[PDB]
Amino acid sequence: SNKKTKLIHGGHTTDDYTGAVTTPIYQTSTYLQDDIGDLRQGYEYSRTANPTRSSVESVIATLENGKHGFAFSSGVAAISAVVMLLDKGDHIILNSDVYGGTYRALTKVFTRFGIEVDFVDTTHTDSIVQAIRPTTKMLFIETPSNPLLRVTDIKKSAEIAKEHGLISVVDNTFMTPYYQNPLDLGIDIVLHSATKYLGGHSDVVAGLVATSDDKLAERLAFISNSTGGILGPQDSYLLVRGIKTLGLRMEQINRSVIEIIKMLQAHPAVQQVFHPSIESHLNHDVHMAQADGHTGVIAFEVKNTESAKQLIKATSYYTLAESLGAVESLISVPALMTHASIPADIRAKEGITDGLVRISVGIEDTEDLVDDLKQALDTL
Amino acid sequence: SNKKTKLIHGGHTTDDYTGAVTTPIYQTSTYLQDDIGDLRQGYEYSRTANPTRSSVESVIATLENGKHGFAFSSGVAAISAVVMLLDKGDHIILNSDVYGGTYRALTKVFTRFGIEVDFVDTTHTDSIVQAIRPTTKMLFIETPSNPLLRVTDIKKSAEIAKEHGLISVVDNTFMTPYYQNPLDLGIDIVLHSATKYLGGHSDVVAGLVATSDDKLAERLAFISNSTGGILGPQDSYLLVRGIKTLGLRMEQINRSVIEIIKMLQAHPAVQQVFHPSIESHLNHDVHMAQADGHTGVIAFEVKNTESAKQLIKATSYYTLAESLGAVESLISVPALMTHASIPADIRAKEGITDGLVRISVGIEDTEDLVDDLKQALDTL
Amino acid sequence: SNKKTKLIHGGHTTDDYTGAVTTPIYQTSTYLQDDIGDLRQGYEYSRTANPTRSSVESVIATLENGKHGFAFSSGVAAISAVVMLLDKGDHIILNSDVYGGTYRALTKVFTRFGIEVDFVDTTHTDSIVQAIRPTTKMLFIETPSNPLLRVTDIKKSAEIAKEHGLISVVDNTFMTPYYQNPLDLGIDIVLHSATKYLGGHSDVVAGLVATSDDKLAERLAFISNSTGGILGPQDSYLLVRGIKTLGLRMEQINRSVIEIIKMLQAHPAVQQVFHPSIESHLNHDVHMAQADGHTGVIAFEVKNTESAKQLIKATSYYTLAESLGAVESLISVPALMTHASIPADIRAKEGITDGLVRISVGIEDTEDLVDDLKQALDTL
Amino acid sequence: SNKKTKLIHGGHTTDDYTGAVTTPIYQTSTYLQDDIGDLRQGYEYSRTANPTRSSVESVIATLENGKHGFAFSSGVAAISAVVMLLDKGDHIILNSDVYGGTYRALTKVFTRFGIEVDFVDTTHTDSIVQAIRPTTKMLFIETPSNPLLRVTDIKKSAEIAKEHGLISVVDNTFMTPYYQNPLDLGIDIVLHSATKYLGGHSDVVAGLVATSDDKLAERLAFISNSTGGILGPQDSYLLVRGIKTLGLRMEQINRSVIEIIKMLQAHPAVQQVFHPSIESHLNHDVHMAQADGHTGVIAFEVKNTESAKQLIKATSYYTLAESLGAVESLISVPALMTHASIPADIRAKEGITDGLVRISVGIEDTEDLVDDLKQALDTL
Ligand SMILES: O=C(O)CNC(=O)Cn1ccc2ccc(Br)cc21
Ligand SMILES: O=C(O)CNC(=O)Cn1ccc2ccc(Br)cc21
Ligand SMILES: O=C(O)CNC(=O)Cn1ccc2ccc(Br)cc21
Ligand SMILES: O=C(O)CNC(=O)Cn1ccc2ccc(Br)cc21
Ligand SMILES: O=C(O)CNC(=O)Cn1ccc2ccc(Br)cc21
Ligand SMILES: O=C(O)CNC(=O)Cn1ccc2ccc(Br)cc21
Ligand SMILES: O=C(O)CNC(=O)Cn1ccc2ccc(Br)cc21
Ligand SMILES: O=C(O)CNC(=O)Cn1ccc2ccc(Br)cc21
Ligand code: NA
Ligand code: NA
Ligand code: NA
Ligand code: NA
Ligand code: NA
Ligand code: NA
Ligand code: NA
Ligand code: NA
């Protein structure tokens, strides 16, 4: 019925054989056959299928209201498998500010294989329509994006893709299946870096993909079996375990996000704040129409580099590290950490200022996170 | 000094911090930074590098006398990363009977990206010279091959690749680093399905790659970080653990291989036997010059399908399952299991007869394995 | 500062060496020494100490405001280590309705070693005073107890123990450190079955012990090292991971407990309800004075055995299984499952009626759990 | 049939459900019941039984030719469970030089519970007969012992125990089930620190117990369930995995032991050598009659403390660390590490001289281990 119940009882995460209430960890590569070709339970070689991996795949398919799930060794392995649905000469449209790893994979790996890409401003969906070429085969969007949290209309993107015969893909990492379900809005394929919120404990690198399309699922299964970027069984188990608390974790994160944004907007040492919950944020209405909650990633401007570094050093409960979706609140400076190779003037033009700080809100007490960030900002 | 000592003390497989005599399992995705950009020990995000994975990479680099190691989520993920060194329009030469997964990846995935491939009989190395095109960039060989154990001259292949400016790659799965070291013979890149002998216990799916070439290593590291087919930390740990006994396991397997082949050659229900240790085997001399032991994979002909099935049912110590390199002796029928989609007449032309049986010799007692297979053959 | 923050940042659960934001899993038995007797980081043999186990021990010591933590292979191993503080001829007072495993250990194992025990009604603390013998050395209490949730005054029990020179022990499993902190109320030793709420995911069997007493800690460390009921490193890691969400899980459980109790009290198919939150419950005031929340275990009477079985079969979201503290809501019938060997008339005298049902509330949606249990009760 | 085959195919170490060729890791605490009291496969709570633990228990029962196996959290937890078969007032006879942890457990823990113990020289079995008291209930022997490798006659000890109504127990750690099978010689209970040779990779702390006696098995199962020193599932899995190579590892170790002893006997810097393979060793004939191989533990005298330390520093392939049964060769000095709290004059009287060195031979190349130790001794 309701989402918190579905997180516990959705998917197949018990052992039919013993009744174990958690998925057994099948640390195994191969399986006995009683007769040549007769598989006891459908398993024959762990690259092709492994029962613990099948469990986490059933979970992500259930949570995204899809039919087929796929677990990969990383988020970018999931993205690469999806891109491999295309051939040399095919074209992809993506949002302009896609994740740096996605940008790198597309422009430094897959363009060498003849895949063509264009990065356009999808916050106006007619930009997608203009960018469609006779060779376009795929539309790939993140919403909200990193680190400025730009929002793209999922339902309209799906309609455009359907009209023009494109495979539509949404990277749903930042919102999770708890708040945003792209397959329900007509999208062909949804994917996640499960490294972030889904695992939730900063202890698994993994990607997850879900679809309702039987033919796309067959193609993805073939790509996974042939290029072999599969998630192992221990990591699959830890993902299943982490997903159990996704609802509680996201709800705590959201309570803190709301109070933190209030504080940041009031604080004189903070300038622009970037988050889709802010009513003046571009496509705020679109976000609220396609999601019933918020990501825990917030970006905001302080004055300069020295102020950003001082902010990081003055906090007690914000941890300097890469990644997001931890139980810990994480803090970073995109201009120094993720966008550092981009020329400074171009960073500034794109809004990635020296003083732009990104936080990924964790599950600490809300009052503590607000007070800690506020007292640290008071030292500026 | 000697190989069995190198297996124990080669590579870095202890904890410098606590002194733990085994590699800690870093079930983690990200790492604290004390200052922005300052990494305590060089780690920042587990997709890019993870200390347990670094341990297994150091092991495979040491055992193959290379400088750089890479651990992937599967053997075919290692192969795919190596193929991704090339661009659309580049050409690869491979041996004619390459592993089915390699054949599938190349002809159903990478040809869609404009990679061109030719499968030629590399048992005569002048066949390679004839097949070189102006666009050829890579030579990829297995030796010995599956399931007929064809042998290719590694040193001559390396010389040809060097003269013609090709990247040379050897899939060294069947021989392992214990018996055959392609990098020592001039090969650029060596790779393994660690799923087989290296892990050794049928409980990890994994690939390993080693090279001495700094530039190829940089390119492989970029591909691994960008497409993300990385091995997780638990599987990395189990690989390090399994490799400790590689020498003892391979030596037991070899003692059994020799006695089993004697039995098969004497038995009236067995026709042709395929293994590089047989003195009339093509390129037997080449194999003995480039390896100081043998693979545990043997193929041999019985009369027909019914005889093969009866053989499988009559054995007590041979287990019907996919894969090789277990501690258990495994048995299979290629025409029914791995080559089944190929037309029967073409199978026969290629020597994959209905009665061709493949065994992967395990570490059971030699007398038991000989006697068991012999008594089972006596029922034919 | 606040409890939810302490759950994330309390204890030492990162790697000082690499900066890994999770505790490495030291799957190791022994440690290099650079010189005889010189330990790099204090580790020499994993039975004596293991760094992953040290992490979970630091967590439980922090959460209970103690100084020393100890991790055992099970809750009853923790209890047995604590009982082994005593000698033949020493006497223990315990509450009358102590956990069945504790009762069994004391009356079938430790009485064979000359430990004397008396089980008295500790809901009136003067019962403890009367039961003190010249040989009494320990007072061991659970609060609230199972399955009728009897409450014992912790502060008064600690005062009695101090005045009479007894070691005071509280089994704090049902309340967890999130709601009840016996060491703060003067108790010498607090212990948990971490199998229940602390691990929280039904996937670790483990016990945890904490104390502020240096001498008791030294004695417990000696007992643990000598009898060896230690928690392994993988289970220690999973405990550390599970504890991160303890606050969120307990708070969800408590919201559901309150609404479920309202429903049960209103329902005509339910008679007596047992839970310390009910204002007419014995020692309700005492509980509220020593805890700031509630356990998720509730017991309630339906008519008979057939009604209890029908209730179990009619629910969709209550799972029939042993144990408590899962993410799933669990349901059981003590008279058939835990108290079955006790004569029926004695069960009835003790209030363990044929129709007594115990539920352990999980983290499913509150409305779903209420509605599901209510519709199932409507079928009676 | 033969031992190396039994190590692979003995016990139940596959999954009947999926056919997985390795034992699944049941990281779980509890199990679904379809009806109250109906267990799908006999599992209800992991402390009582866990399927991965059941696998390793089946292995040790098979390898020792027993009927029942038990897996504990450590060797000393197995020993403690066995001692708990007795009551206050019962007496145990043990060999004089029993393992220090066993000595400590008995004399500092179990004597506080009224168990009486005597440590006698069991190398003459009539010493046992003299030591029998009217209250003696158990005879507990190690053979060979540590660190001087004293040998006790197992068959005669079993006969004495049977005649006098004693439970007979052999700690078979040093020999392993590969070479010595006490249950076959009439002993009631055999136990191991699986931390040593059985796990074999210095990465599990664990104990194992086997018996053929149904009544002793019932009592041990009750003790394990009640005091809870159980082995967890990950450690159980790693034990099953390590045992696969026990035969190969022990045989390599034995080849090295023989050559190393030859070297030590010839070397002028070495005085007495202690190992049961030496023909002048006390009870050499007894050992050869009850075992068909040797332990890898050897002790030998060099001149003094400084010589022992120099030996340790001069070796390349001998590692200073506690424990034995690693894949690495380990070296230690009992007088400084295990026997240090004993007065120096008493150490000398017992033969634990300042220059007594203990090595635990690993699986490195035999020539390397011989040459390394010899060149290190040459520096003295
Ligand atoms: O949760 C929501 O609000 C909407 N989700 C649904 O469509 C309900 N739903 C679909 C599959 C499924 C499995 C278990 C449970 Br419990 C609920 C389930
Ligand atoms: O690593 C990350 O997450 C940052 N991602 C990128 O580098 C994306 N990207 C690619 C070209 C480019 C130019 C300006 C800006 Br602003 C961003 C750009
Ligand atoms: O082993 C052989 O026969 C040949 N191999 C070698 O080149 C020796 N060798 C190279 C690196 C290295 C590390 C540890 C040990 Br121990 C030996 C090592
Ligand atoms: O799956 C496996 O291991 C078998 N590998 C293959 O299918 C390789 N392969 C590809 C075309 C082809 C034609 C005849 C024969 Br014979 C083999 C062929
Ligand atoms: O949490 C409460 O209400 C009371 N607890 C405390 O006494 C606060 N406290 C004690 C140790 C400690 C470590 C980290 C953090 Br964050 C808070 C800590
Ligand atoms: O297993 C469990 O949890 C139940 N625990 C017990 O059996 C405790 N216990 C011991 C004697 C006794 C008599 C009546 C009643 Br009511 C309970 C009793
Ligand atoms: O191995 C020896 O020399 C003696 N051992 C035996 O008594 C043979 N034996 C007993 C049980 C059993 C299970 C599998 C295999 Br294979 C062999 C087995
Ligand atoms: O720790 C270890 O392994 C060493 N074991 C012991 O301490 C055993 N032990 C107990 C009293 C005693 C007196 C002399 C000698 Br010699 C040994 C003695
Ligand atoms: Na489910
Ligand atoms: Na659709
Ligand atoms: Na090393
Ligand atoms: Na080279
Ligand atoms: Na902390
Ligand atoms: Na106190
Ligand atoms: Na078996
Ligand atoms: Na017997």
Side-chain angles (χ1 to χ4, degrees), chain B residues 1-6 8-9 13-14 21-22 199-204 234 237-239 241-245 248-252 255 316-319 321 327-330 363-369, chain D residues 1-6 8-9 13-14 21-22 199-204 234 237-239 241-245 248-252 255 316-319 321 327-330 363-369:
Chain B
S1 189
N2 290 322
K3 301 192 284 187
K4 282 170 181 175
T5 305
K6 190 177 178 180
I8 303 308
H9 298 284
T13 62
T14 63
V21 299
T22 54
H201 296 71
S202 310
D203 66 356
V204 174
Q234 187 69 36
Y237 177 75
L238 289 168
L239 278 195
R241 189 191 209 252
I243 289 168
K244 310 291 190 190
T245 53
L248 306 187
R249 293 185 282 103
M250 293 312 287
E251 289 192 354
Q252 173 75 16
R255 291 188 287 271
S316 291
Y317 305 129
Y318 293 76
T319 290
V327 296
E328 297 86 359
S329 292
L330 303 186
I363 62 165
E364 301 97 333
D365 182 81
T366 295
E367 201 170 325
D368 284 340
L369 290 176
Chain D
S1 189
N2 290 322
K3 301 192 284 187
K4 282 170 181 175
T5 305
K6 190 177 178 180
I8 303 308
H9 298 284
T13 62
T14 63
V21 299
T22 54
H201 296 71
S202 310
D203 66 356
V204 174
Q234 187 69 36
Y237 177 75
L238 289 168
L239 278 195
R241 189 191 209 252
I243 289 168
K244 310 291 190 190
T245 53
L248 306 187
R249 293 185 282 103
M250 293 312 287
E251 289 192 354
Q252 173 75 16
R255 291 188 287 271
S316 291
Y317 305 129
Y318 293 76
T319 290
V327 296
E328 297 86 359
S329 292
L330 303 186
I363 62 165
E364 301 97 333
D365 182 81
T366 295
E367 201 170 325
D368 284 340
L369 290 176

Side-chain angles (χ1 to χ4, degrees), chain C residues 153-154 156-161 163-169:
Chain C
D153 191 323
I154 296 171
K156 287 192 183 178
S157 293
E159 290 170 7
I160 293 165
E163 189 185 332
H164 293 268
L166 316 181
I167 301 166
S168 60
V169 184

Side-chain angles (χ1 to χ4, degrees), chain D residues 53-87 89-154 156-161 163-214 216-302 304-305 307-334:
Chain D
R53 199 173 87 234
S54 295
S55 180
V56 76
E57 292 172 343
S58 83
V59 171
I60 192 64
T62 298
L63 295 182
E64 291 285 22
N65 298 323
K67 182 167 177 204
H68 309 282
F70 301 87
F72 294 91
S73 51
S74 65
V76 298
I79 292 164
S80 300
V82 168
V83 170
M84 282 182 165
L85 292 168
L86 306 186
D87 299 350
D90 290 347
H91 176 256
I92 316 176
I93 298 166
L94 307 94
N95 50 291
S96 55
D97 54 355
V98 80
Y99 169 68
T102 306
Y103 176 86
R104 285 187 302 109
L106 275 301
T107 60
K108 313 267 180 303
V109 180
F110 290 105
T111 53
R112 298 191 287 104
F113 304 132
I115 307 296
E116 307 282 359
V117 293
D118 276 284
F119 303 89
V120 307
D121 196 321
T122 54
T123 60
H124 198 311
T125 54
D126 276 350
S127 184
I128 302 162
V129 173
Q130 184 189 319
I132 288 170
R133 306 170 180 263
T135 54
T136 305
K137 298 290 177 183
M138 179 172 284
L139 172 61
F140 183 113
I141 61 172
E142 305 156 334
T143 178
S145 64
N146 181 71
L148 301 182
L149 287 309
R150 301 191 172 104
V151 172
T152 297
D153 191 323
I154 296 171
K156 287 192 183 178
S157 293
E159 290 170 7
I160 293 165
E163 189 185 332
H164 293 268
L166 316 181
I167 301 166
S168 60
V169 184
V170 169
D171 184 335
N172 196 36
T173 298
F174 272 28
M175 291 314 304
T176 84
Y178 193 71
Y179 288 134
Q180 188 169 264
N181 299 122
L183 301 187
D184 285 349
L185 303 172
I187 294 294
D188 293 316
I189 300 173
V190 64
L191 61 81
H192 298 263
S193 170
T195 309
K196 317 297 172 61
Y197 292 110
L198 283 163
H201 296 71
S202 310
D203 66 356
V204 174
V205 173
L208 293 169
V209 181
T211 187
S212 296
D213 191 304
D214 285 348
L216 291 175
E218 190 175 10
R219 290 163 65 183
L220 286 169
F222 185 86
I223 288 162
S224 176
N225 193 55
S226 299
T227 59
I230 59 154
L231 192 61
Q234 187 69 36
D235 293 302
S236 295
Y237 177 75
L238 289 168
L239 278 195
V240 168
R241 189 191 209 252
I243 289 168
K244 310 291 190 190
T245 53
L246 178 70
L248 306 187
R249 293 185 282 103
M250 293 312 287
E251 289 192 354
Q252 173 75 16
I253 284 159
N254 269 233
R255 291 188 287 271
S256 294
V257 160
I258 294 155
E259 302 304 315
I260 289 169
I261 288 174
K262 287 172 181 174
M263 187 275 296
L264 291 171
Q265 290 175 319
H267 202 285
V270 174
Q271 285 107 80
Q272 194 165 0
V273 184
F274 301 91
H275 192 265
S277 74
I278 296 169
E279 296 188 352
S280 56
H281 197 83
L282 167 65
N283 282 337
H284 165 85
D285 61 338
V286 168
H287 178 82
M288 305 296 308
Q290 69 196 11
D292 56 5
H294 288 294
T295 187
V297 174
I298 308 166
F300 59 91
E301 296 167 352
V302 297
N304 52 31
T305 297
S307 296
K309 288 181 172 177
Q310 170 56 29
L311 185 64
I312 291 167
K313 294 263 191 233
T315 50
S316 291
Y317 305 129
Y318 293 76
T319 290
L320 178 59
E322 287 284 344
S323 207
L324 53 141
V327 296
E328 297 86 359
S329 292
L330 303 186
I331 186 153
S332 68
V333 181

Side-chain angles (χ1 to χ4, degrees), chain C residues 33-37 39-87 89-154 156-161 163-179:
Chain C
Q33 301 178 25
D34 294 320
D35 294 284
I36 294 179
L39 314 179
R40 295 189 180 168
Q41 289 291 329
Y43 294 93
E44 99 185 276
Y45 191 67
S46 284
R47 166 156 45 72
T48 309
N50 172 287
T52 312
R53 199 173 87 234
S54 295
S55 180
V56 76
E57 292 172 343
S58 83
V59 171
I60 192 64
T62 298
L63 295 182
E64 291 285 22
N65 298 323
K67 182 167 177 204
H68 309 282
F70 301 87
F72 294 91
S73 51
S74 65
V76 298
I79 292 164
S80 300
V82 168
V83 170
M84 282 182 165
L85 292 168
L86 306 186
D87 299 350
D90 290 347
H91 176 256
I92 316 176
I93 298 166
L94 307 94
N95 50 291
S96 55
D97 54 355
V98 80
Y99 169 68
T102 306
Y103 176 86
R104 285 187 302 109
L106 275 301
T107 60
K108 313 267 180 303
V109 180
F110 290 105
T111 53
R112 298 191 287 104
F113 304 132
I115 307 296
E116 307 282 359
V117 293
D118 276 284
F119 303 89
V120 307
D121 196 321
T122 54
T123 60
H124 198 311
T125 54
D126 276 350
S127 184
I128 302 162
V129 173
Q130 184 189 319
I132 288 170
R133 306 170 180 263
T135 54
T136 305
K137 298 290 177 183
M138 179 172 284
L139 172 61
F140 183 113
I141 61 172
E142 305 156 334
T143 178
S145 64
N146 181 71
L148 301 182
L149 287 309
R150 301 191 172 104
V151 172
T152 297
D153 191 323
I154 296 171
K156 287 192 183 178
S157 293
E159 290 170 7
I160 293 165
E163 189 185 332
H164 293 268
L166 316 181
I167 301 166
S168 60
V169 184
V170 169
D171 184 335
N172 196 36
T173 298
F174 272 28
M175 291 314 304
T176 84
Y178 193 71
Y179 288 134

Side-chain angles (χ1 to χ4, degrees), chain A residues 328, chain C residues 5-14 58-59 244:
Chain A
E328 297 86 359
Chain C
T5 305
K6 190 177 178 180
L7 283 164
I8 303 308
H9 298 284
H12 179 57
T13 62
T14 63
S58 83
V59 171
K244 310 291 190 190

